[PDB]
Structures are given as structure tokens and as C-alpha cells.
């Protein structure tokens, strides 16, 4: 076994969703990704651009949610507010019976007014672009001393010249012990030392 979703250990109203997204079997990367995701080891997996691999880490990322806690516990870290968008999307709907998970999209897009008054509600669950979540951040508008978890889906575009030194900024606010969930198409140099620097025992998947 191994290749079906109830073999992962995941909350049935979690299930519930992720069968209503279409996905009856978990394709490759969610199942070599998933059950390893869900122990707490960090990750480093090559996946094509797009919203493909969403699954593989929001699943994972839902299911270690507490809802009783009202404080950001996962963060997604993406270039475009397009992908924030749809990636957004893709979990309020896998997350839909859970009973109260709140998700938040923040980017360029958004006027940053209105994104601070929406975190003076509950948010579990924060999808953003570089600039926007450091600046939610620094503004203390933003808490996340409880982020536990911190997915970076495209992780060469966001370790690019233009954004390197604010996701440095970014993971320097979190827990010291932050599980790191990183994606992307390509491992260049900027990606090696990033993981380097923060990853600790990273599992690969090439
Ligand atoms: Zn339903």
C-alpha cells in the first residue's frame, strides 16, 4: 500500500475535500511527498511550474492545522498573485468541511488597507508574494510567531536577484524550527544555498 489517500493518516473531513477536488488517487509526487511532508522533515522536490504540485503540500499543511488556535500556522510563498490566486482557491475548496479554516491571499494585487484589517480576523492560513508578506510583517499586522510551517512554490523565481534577500527577511521573523516545504521546476545555485542555510536534513525528490 502507500498509494491511497486514507494511508496517509489524514482527517476524514480533510478527505472529504480533496476527493471533491477530483482527486480519487494521489498522483507521484503527493505520494512521495505527503507521508514524509506530515512527519515534520523538510522538503526539497522538483516539480514543474503551476498549481500540479499544489496538493502535494496543502494537504500536508491542512492536515497539521489546529483550528482551535486562531493565530497564522502556515504560510505559501508564491511570485505571482496569479498563483496565490489559484493556489487560494484550490485549498478553501480541499479545506471546505474542516468545520472553520480560514484562508488569506495577500499580494501586489490587494491594497494593502484592506489586507490589515482582514488580519484582525482569524487567519490560519496565509498565501502571499514576496513584498506584501514581509511588509504585513514588519507593520506587526501580520503574527507569525506561530507559523509552523512554510511552503516556497517556485522556489528559483522567488530566490531570483529581486526577491532572494526578502524571503532572507521572511524566514528570519519565524520560529527558528519552522518545517520548510520548498518546490521548483530548477535547483540553481540561489536555490542550493538558500537550502543550504535553512533546511535541515532535507528530504530530495528529484
Ligand atoms: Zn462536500
Given at each position: 500500500?502507500?498509494n491511497?489517500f486514507?494511508?496517509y493518516?489524514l482527517?476524514?473531513?480533510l478527505?472529504?475535500?480533496?476527493f471533491?477536488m477530483?482527486?480519487?488517487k494521489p498522483?507521484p509526487?503527493?505520494?512521495?511527498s505527503?507521508p514524509?511532508?506530515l512527519?515534520?522533515?523538510?522538503?526539497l522536490?522538483?516539480?514543474?511550474?503551476?498549481?500540479?504540485?499544489?496538493?502535494?503540500?496543502?494537504?500536508?499543511?491542512?492536515?497539521?492545522?489546529?483550528l482551535?488556535?486562531?493565530?497564522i500556522?502556515?504560510m505559501?510563498?508564491?511570485?505571482?498573485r496569479?498563483?496565490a490566486?489559484?493556489?487560494?482557491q484550490?485549498?478553501?475548496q480541499?479545506s471546505?468541511?474542516?468545520?472553520?479554516?480560514?484562508?488569506?491571499?495577500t499580494?501586489?494585487?490587494?491594497?494593502?488597507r484592506?489586507?490589515?484589517?482582514?488580519l484582525?480576523?482569524?487567519v490560519?492560513?496565509?498565501?502571499?508574494?514576496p513584498g506584501?508578506?514581509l511588509?504585513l510583517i514588519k507593520?506587526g499586522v501580520?503574527?507569525?510567531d506561530?507559523?509552523?510551517?512554510?511552503?516556497?512554490?517556485?522556489?528559483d523565481?522567488?530566490?531570483?536577484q529581486?526577491?532572494?534577500?526578502?524571503?532572507?527577511?521572511?524566514?528570519?521573523?519565524?520560529p527558528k524550527?519552522?518545517?520548510?516545504?520548498?518546490y521548483?521546476?530548477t535547483?540553481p545555485?540561489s536555490?542550493?544555498?538558500?537550502m543550504?542555510?535553512?533546511l535541515?536534513?532535507?528530504?530530495?525528490?528529484?
Open positions: 500500500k502507500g491511497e486514507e494511508d493518516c482527517k476524514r473531513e478527505l472529504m475535500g480533496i471533491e477530483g482527486w480519487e498522483s509526487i503527493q505520494e512521495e505527503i514524509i511532508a512527519s515534520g522533515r523538510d522538503i522536490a522538483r516539480a514543474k511550474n503551476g498549481t500540479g504540485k499544489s496538493g502535494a503540500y496543502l494537504i500536508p499543511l491542512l492536515e497539521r492545522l489546529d482551535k488556535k486562531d493565530n500556522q502556515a505559501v510563498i508564491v511570485p505571482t496569479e498563483l490566486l489559484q493556489v487560494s484550490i485549498c478553501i480541499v471546505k468541511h474542516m468545520g472553520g479554516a480560514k484562508v488569506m491571499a499580494t501586489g494585487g490587494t491594497n494593502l484592506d489586507d490589515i484589517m482582514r484582525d480576523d482569524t490560519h492560513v496565509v498565501i502571499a508574494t506584501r508578506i511588509d507593520k501580520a503574527k507569525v506561530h507559523v509552523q510551517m512554510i511552503v516556497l512554490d517556485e522556489a523565481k522567488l530566490l531570483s529581486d526577491f532572494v534577500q526578502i524571503m532572507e527577511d521572511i524566514i528570519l521573523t519565524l524550527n519552522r518545517q520548510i516545504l520548498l521548483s521546476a535547483f545555485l536555490v542550493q544555498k538558500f543550504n542555510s535553512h535541515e536534513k532535507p528530504y530530495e525528490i528529484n
